[PDB]
Amino acid sequence: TFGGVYQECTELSGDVLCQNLEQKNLLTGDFSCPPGYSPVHLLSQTHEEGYSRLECKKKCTLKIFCKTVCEDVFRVAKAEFRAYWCVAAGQPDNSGLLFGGVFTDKTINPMTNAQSCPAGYIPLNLFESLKVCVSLDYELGFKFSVPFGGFFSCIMGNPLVNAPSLKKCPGGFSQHLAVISDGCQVSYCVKAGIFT
């Protein structure tokens, strides 16, 4: 079962960037997993954004000679985001989240053949631009849902494959690339054959 995703954020350059990066877990209201689920660290990265401002300053040589020089000063704003997903550490079986596919600002969600979530699904923000479609209404949301077999990234394996984590999809699941974040692959597992 799939327990949701979350993404923490930390400001390392005294700025304001986390507003877009952090994402709380639906089921807990916090950056944590529900009871019976364990966090699986997908990725840790530093998001950088260039901010250039022009500044003029008065410089005086000996106090009698006043000269105003105008330089634009370039600065970089940095914040670290840490993206995790929640996996069933044990086994309440009637819990978790339904999976309705993922997409980015540049890719499409094959479930809808558009950059959107299925009807009645919530997009959860992950990384810089990834969206994970999730529903909690089983009887209404199940119609648009596909079985989910886990995530794995270039730095963390998929704990659902059956010791360390292996970057593979389990059983009858196939791997599909979710996003490339700063040169690191992040893919997900769904049922084999569903996508065409």
Residue numbers in the entry: 377 to 467, 469 to 539, 548 to 581
Reproduce text from the manuscript describing this model:
Perforin-2 (MPEG1) is thought to enable the killing of invading microbes engulfed by macrophages and other phagocytes, forming pores in their membranes. Because of the presence of a canonical MAC-perforin (MACPF) domain, PFN2 has been proposed to form functional pores in bacterial membranes, leading to bacterial death and control of infection. However, unlike MAC components and perforin-1, PFN2 is initially synthesized as a type I transmembrane protein and found associated with the membranes of intracellular vesicles in which its large ectodomain (consisting mainly of the MACPF domain and a unique P2 domain characteristic of PFN2) projects into the lumen.
We determined structures of the P2 domain in isolation by x-ray crystallography in two crystal forms, with two crystallographically distinct copies in space group P21 at 2.05 Å and eight copies in space group P1 at 3.17 Å. Truncating the β hairpin (residues Y427-V452) within the P2 domain (P2Δhairpin mutant) abolished its binding to PS, cardiolipin, and E. coli lipids, confirming the role of this region in membrane binding by PFN2. The P2 domain helps to stabilize the pre-pore state by swapping between monomers and enables PFN2 to bind its targeted membrane.
